[PDB]
Write a protein that binds this ligand. Sequence first.
Ligand SMILES: *[C@@H]1O[C@H](CO)[C@@H](O[C@@H]2O[C@H](CO)[C@@H](O)[C@H](O)[C@H]2NC(C)=O)[C@H](O)[C@H]1NC(C)=O
Lengths: 50, 47
Amino acid sequence: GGCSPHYILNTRFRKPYNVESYTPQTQGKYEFILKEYESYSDFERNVTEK
Amino acid sequence: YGTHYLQSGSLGGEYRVLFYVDSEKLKQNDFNSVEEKKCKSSGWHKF
Ligand SMILES: *[C@@H]1O[C@H](CO)[C@@H](O[C@@H]2O[C@H](CO)[C@@H](O)[C@H](O)[C@H]2NC(C)=O)[C@H](O)[C@H]1NC(C)=O
């Protein structure tokens, strides 16, 4: 049996006997992490004997 | 079923944004220079 009116947007659904609820609890979580690292090190010498 | 039921309320949507930026820059230059001389001369008159 069943045949209670269940809608999502304009689309109407027939729920299974087994299912208590199927309901559009919409949600969204985005997550962005960017980590850039640089190191440089320079070493020189110049040395002369005459 | 939890602990309570909703006696009244509003429905709609929540939008949140957290956005964070952290830039550091370091540049360092060290320069050192050393110059040394000796000179010597000896002679008499011949040497
Ligand atoms: C070692 O000597 C070289 C040559 O003089 C140096 O490089 C020169 O540096 C001068 C001044 O910055 C520039 O005008 C030249 O074009 C460079 N030439 C070359 C081939 O690099 C260098 O910097 C010196 N290094 C140290 C640690 O004294």
